[PDB]
Paper text:
The inner membrane export gate protein, SctV (InvA in SPI-1 and SsaV in SPI-2), is the largest component of the injectisome and is essential for assembly and function of T3SS. It has been reported that SctV is one of the “engines” of T3SS; the TM domain forms a putative proton channel, and SctVC forms a nonameric ring connecting to SctN (ATPase) through SctO (the stalk protein) to function as the F0F1-ATPase, coupling energy from ATP hydrolysis and the proton-motive force to secrete unfolded bacterial effectors into the eukaryotic host. Consistent with other reported SctVC structures, the SsaVC monomer also has a four-subdomain (SD) structure and further assembles to a nonameric ring aligned to SD3, which is the most conserved region of SsaVC.
Unlike InvAC, SsaVC could maintain a very stable high oligomeric state even in the high salt concentration analyzed by the size exclusion chromatography (SEC) and dynamic light scattering (DLS). Through a cryo-EM single particle analysis approach, we reconstructed and classified two conformations of SsaVC: one 3.55 Å cryo-EM structure with double stacked nonameric rings with D9 symmetry, and the other 3.64 Å cryo-EM structure with a single nonameric ring with C9 symmetry, the particle number of which are approximately comparable. The double-layer ring conformation of SsaVC is considered to be an artifact, consistent with a previous study. Notably, most of the C9 single-layer ring of the SsaVC particles were calculated from top views, and most of the D9 double-layer ring of SsaVC particles came from side views. We speculate that this is because the top-view protein particles are more vulnerable to air–water interface damage than the side-view particles.
Residue numbers in the entry:
A (entry chain Q), B (entry chain R), C (entry chain J), D (entry chain B), E (entry chain A), F (entry chain E): 346 to 681
The structure:
């Protein structure tokens, strides 16, 4: 009877099991650590006797993924596009779309310039997708302590100064709030430097996270679009900025937002209305209204990146696509 | 899985690789340490398989430099001038201009009295340029602790007194603010002496940095122009000095500037307007308005040196070239 | 990569190097320590390949002296006078004048009753001049700690009491302020005794330095003129004394002066006007106005000694040469 | 790279794996520990992708068992008899015979009064057979130390006295020599008591093992035949006893046997000749000739128990079946 | 200047380098450790600028392998056979034969049932061959101490007892003598158990190695031929056994052989004469004459396995192919 | 007054001095350490005022090299050959020949396929020659302790075992005897392993050195001729081998040779007679007579390598050039 759930378990029917699965999963874990900076725990391979070809992914013994992989498809392609269509289905929890492709069509799709997985890879490129959705769950107080112990080797004084500044729960909260936005915490030297700079002058951990995000703006704007080409930007007009800026209520532990449910519902409804025009859009708002806006759109629109103006330096051109704007709702619509 | 990004990585196609590259890079690193006083971390040479002749420079695993060196050019000359023209291109991030010269023309340019690099040197004189742009990133709390440990050998009491005066984060902030202006921190005895003098009488780390810059004025005015010949100086008129002096707002952690965005935009626009007349200009303003002016021109005009009046002693003649002046903008233009 | 600049470096071209240079430099260093009490660091002899006969003196790797010694002169005489003229030039940074003399004329000048250097000495009598200009740079917190450790051998209780009175940064500030005026700190017993006496009753380190200077008045008035003969004295009239006495503004760290730039400029202009009548003049003012006057004339007139009335006891006759006097400038000239 | 082979690995193809395999293997391990007293190491279940239904058992990563279980058989019965025949094959390394029985015939065989395994049990009753053949390999110096540490809880003085008597390598040798004969070492109190009694009076570890076997005679004669019914006994005549008794050669480490290869070959040939008359026979010889006889018949006839006369007390009746006897061979046959 | 040569260096020319080389080499190292039990040191990849496609393998900075891989071949097959012929050459130091195969012929050879390497693998399957020739050089006193420290985790008492028995140089000698015969030391529990058993009763480290080889006979006869099929055996007749048995001369450190050079030369000449009839032959001799025979055939015939009679149990059938026999040479030929 | 001479001093006239001399000497020192394994002490550059272009090399302040480099030669080539002739002279102490070549002829010689030095290199390629003659003087007890301390990092148990075997003076004697024969001690792992193997079984440090030389035979026969081509070998006939083998006289500290001076004189005279036929010859004798022969030819013929038969394995073909043979001298010539 060992307290504490088993972190990451992958249950497979013995048909799906293989001999190179261990090294493929390890390579995927190393790629995920190099990309997002969170050191994932070992994946425990377990055998699930089932006549149907089915796999499950269990996080802390609560099953978060359950998919039954049809026998007809032997080639896997994550996501959908116009060039490739056929035998596609929706992943649960809004993880996206997957396509099972026949051999020749999959070879054509790979020639088209995309990634296509075959064999044990079809498991990794599935499992990895799940791990990219519940990522913020693998960074707590204990994982933060492990990261700080790892950094104590070459950076002893940096870690000692940081501990002298902030208690470990606040550092873990900052790292978790950074991970849950697809911001890599791979560069821990810069993160600890920014926390050391702004720890005496700030106590709201949300604002410390904002400062760390600003200090990491080059990385964010590199990861969002690897090429230098301009990608679409959806501005937020002054109406919404003033609406969310006026409702800021502060207590001894920091500032939060206090809006009517009607305001949030209308803002999300119109943002989803403005998001169906193009596949990818970066919502851009002011610095003082960015985080609050995020925490009214994180529950539903988790995979849309909410950037800020200061995070886009003068060296990035905008190319506005749409300009969302509103007036209030409870007092008078005036826009809606 | 080792936390903490790898500091400095140079990825090369195997054609560009060589046998004397290690010692050439080490010589460049030693020159950079003798010049700017920042001890750089070891450059990790990695091989990048690519049909095109390409190299990348990665700082903390975020690629900051990526250049594809054409096969036709075998002679490299950093910068541009009227005497030499041909096969020149712009370095990214505004690092400057480079010229690829044929053998005979490069020999003529070397005879002209300039530096021309051939072989592994063409890598160093590229890499070094990058390292001269992101220099302020190699000096943090940990590197400051390493410098203080190095100085504990001959200067034990100086370092002990300095630690008794200031905490290590403030010393690291001072050294970083000095490095990010192309002021060498090679002379650590004088820097620690000035911090020991002015630490009890000052708490704004920006002002401590100003005092350290003033105590280093001979070095600054030697490095800006190695010869004693007078170089052009662009004065700042009393209008801008009074504009930025009136907007000084102080909090418990020190004083900052608070100007309208229109004021900053017009000041930078006219400074760039006044900078195209001659290649090099030293902007000179008052002591109380120098640092603030710098922090409204650091984002765009990083490579222009913002000197002060006290940094130019009575032994340096001025030779004013232009006298910039303004009145306000929001209240009334009156100059603009 | 060793932090901390190399203190004192002498770079010489092939021909000027010699075999007795080491012992000549060591003898000069010992003479400078016996004269001014500051223990100088070892001079590092380095070879500078140059077709022209040139030497450089580098303090903390920032070149402070650079002279190209013509081949025609083989006899060196520091300073100028009416009896000897020919092949003379101005040393940089206003260190003085030098004369290169032919063998017979140099023998005649030596017979005249002056010092003439030949061989390796021509280097020392040059280097020493430089070391007599930047002397105050070889006395900091660390050198003060070395002096106190040296004095802990015979004077243990004196040093212990002094440490109990003043922190090491204030002692180093006092010693530096004494060295930067050509006042020897060779007599450390008396200096520590005066600091022990006046430390409880005073907190302005400038005033502690004034008291130490007064307690050393016999040494000062011996070193200024080794013979008992009366040398010229330039009094400061009551107008300037009252002008600088009225502007004394005190803060928690001590008192400073606050004068208009016009006042300082006119005072220095007239002092230089009054200094061209005779080669050497001792400016004499009151005790309460002495140090402040010094800190308005140190930047330009570094080599003129600013004595005080209490430093000249009743046993030294004055022989006034000129009596400078003024009224204010901004309110009304009335003298200027 | 972890030194030391993985102790016990069971590799199974997709279809043979199950969900209750873990608890079935654990129950088999507990039964084996309760029966033979050797604490087995954890069985590591690994998946072996193979179209054919195959399993392998690996001891220290050297595969000792490899069996391909035909799809037609779903009911397993270990061993063979006249009542049940059909679909039977020989296990490798002479482990015995197995029968794959159809459902109805297996139910009839179970009704007959035998054990029949179905499902995951068909793996255990296979694996267990292997573990009953290489048992003596799971008891070394380290496992002996683990047993003694377990006994230090209730029997601290017994273990302390035993350690004071014999070094751990001799205790491990005794336990190994007892395990490799199908004598349980479950009763460690009695074994340690007998080693404590006879350790001062004996140094030949083989003779200590003989004394421990004699002190355990009740257990041996209970385990060989659980019921009190008389089972067949094959006596060894005085000729063989005198032949092996005369050849006893002793060195400082104890006594061994030295026989001609012809003698051993003829003895084994006739014993196998006398063993085909009945399925089970207990070979019984004198005390002084028992162990030596065992070590000339252990290589080939491993599973036949070589009892002694003193191990069969006066309360066990004999019922001799055959009386083997010989004269020598090299000198003269006289019997063979 | 770091004493101690760099263990394993692989130098490759520009084009042979790749991106998956690191993981391919690591997989080869892990396979070599799982096979032969010797933990190899990290392979250092270095770039060797060379117009010709060449690689070198350096053991302790003494180049042991140097091969220039022709551009025409892109498919590699280690060894030679009748089914595949074309573009084959001899590896240096008698490592074997290699074949460079065109794509279609290599696919046909892979279909034939052999291993064919392409890409970075062509390096590994080369490097690995070298590592299988100088294997006995990666096991010394220090590597033995590392193995014993690794075994101290689960087997603490086994290692402690072994250290109490034998000093570390003798254990390292035993492990080295086992590795230099292609006997895996992966099973360290059994090796340490056999050394603990036979350490008190033996002092000749060669005989301890013989006992450890006998205790590992199942592993040896499994690795020599993975299948149970009978492979050819070349017996050694009684003449050679008696010749080498008579010449055994013992000193305080153990027994060695003392034969005339003519005897050794004739024995090797006839063994090579008897080895050209079939590709693989296992030379089998008596126990008392096995090791000595090995140490007269190790210098020339390194890759032929010299088994013994006791290492082949009664369960392995022989299938003699030839029966070598001789009389002496110096006294009288009588056979040669 | 510091006891202990200054190890390595290079005195140069200031014309020969340069700016890159420090790094050129450091590169030469690193090459010498990589080649011969002896860590050389820092070269102290001193200036020697001399009208003539002269340099001296001082080992422990006893001048071992003194050369006056003529002004006419500006290109240096070490050694002589038929292809290049002109302005050549003999180095002192039989270090060899040097050639000063004019620019065009030196370029032709470099094109011929040799090494030609210009500038500061002309000093290194001189100094290095000296360091290759008195090499055995830079390895004593203290340098051996430094090497063992360096090896204590990765090889702690190897060094500890070696210290337990041999005292440091014997290890230093072995390393010195290996260095004074141009055998590299770069591979310290193998040397310490061989000393650990043969330390219990041998006490004559000369024989331990012989065993270490035999274990290093591959390195010796690689360094003597880098290519695999056969180089000439001068055998020593059985007469000399029997002469020096009969005179072996042993005392408690080992065996030495005791020959008549006539025997040694005749052997050296004829060896020099046999050495003028070809430039390079490897003298090859038996194992039991090798070292003794070396210690009768080390005083005069220092640079000729005295190999052995066991050092040339069966894989190196001989190509005898001459076969020297003698009978005794004092009893009767019979050959001489």
């Amino acid at each position: 009877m060992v307290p504490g759930a088993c972190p990451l378990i992958l249950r497979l029917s013995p048909t799906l099991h293989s001999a190179d699965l261990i090294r493929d999963i390890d390579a995927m874990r190393w790629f995920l650590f190099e990309d997002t900076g969170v050191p994932l725990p070992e994946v425990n391979i377990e055998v699930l006797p089932e006549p149907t070809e089915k796999l499950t992914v269990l996080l802390y013994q609560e099953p978060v993924f359950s998919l039954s992989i049809p026998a007809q498809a032997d080639y896997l392609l994550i996501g959908a596009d116009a060039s490739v269509v056929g035998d596609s289905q929706t992943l649960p929890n809004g993880m996206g779309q997957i396509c099972w492709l026949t051999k020749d069509m999959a070879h054509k799709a790979q020639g088209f310039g995309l990634d296509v997985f075959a064999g044990s890879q079809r498991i990794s490129a599935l499992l990895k997708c799940v791990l990219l959705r519940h990522m913020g769950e693998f960074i707590g107080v204990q994982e933060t302590r492990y990261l700080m112990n790892a950094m104590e080797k070459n950076y002893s004084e940096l870690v000692k100064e940081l501990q002298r500044q902030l208690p470990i729960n606040k550092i873990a909260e900052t790292l978790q709030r950074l991970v849950s936005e697809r911001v890599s915490i791979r560069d821990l030297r810069l993160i600890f430097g920014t926390l050391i700079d702004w720890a005496p002058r700030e106590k709201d951990v949300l604002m410390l996270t904002e400062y760390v995000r600003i200090a990491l703006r080059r990385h964010i704007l590199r990861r969002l679009n690897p090429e230098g080409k301009p990608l679409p930007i959806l501005r937020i007009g002054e109406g919404i900025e003033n609406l969310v800026r006026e409702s800021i209520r502060q207590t001894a532990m920091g500032t939060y937002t206090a809006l009517s449910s009607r305001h949030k519902t209308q803002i999300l409804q119109l943002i989803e209305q403005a998001l169906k025009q193009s596949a990818k859009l970066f919502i851009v708002t002011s610095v003082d209204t960015r985080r609050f806006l995020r925490k009214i759109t994180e529950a539903t629109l988790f995979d849309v990146p909410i950037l800020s103006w200061q995070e886009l330096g003068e060296e990035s051109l905008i190319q506005v696509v749409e300009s969302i704007d509103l007036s209030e709702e409870e007092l008078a619509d005036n826009e809606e």
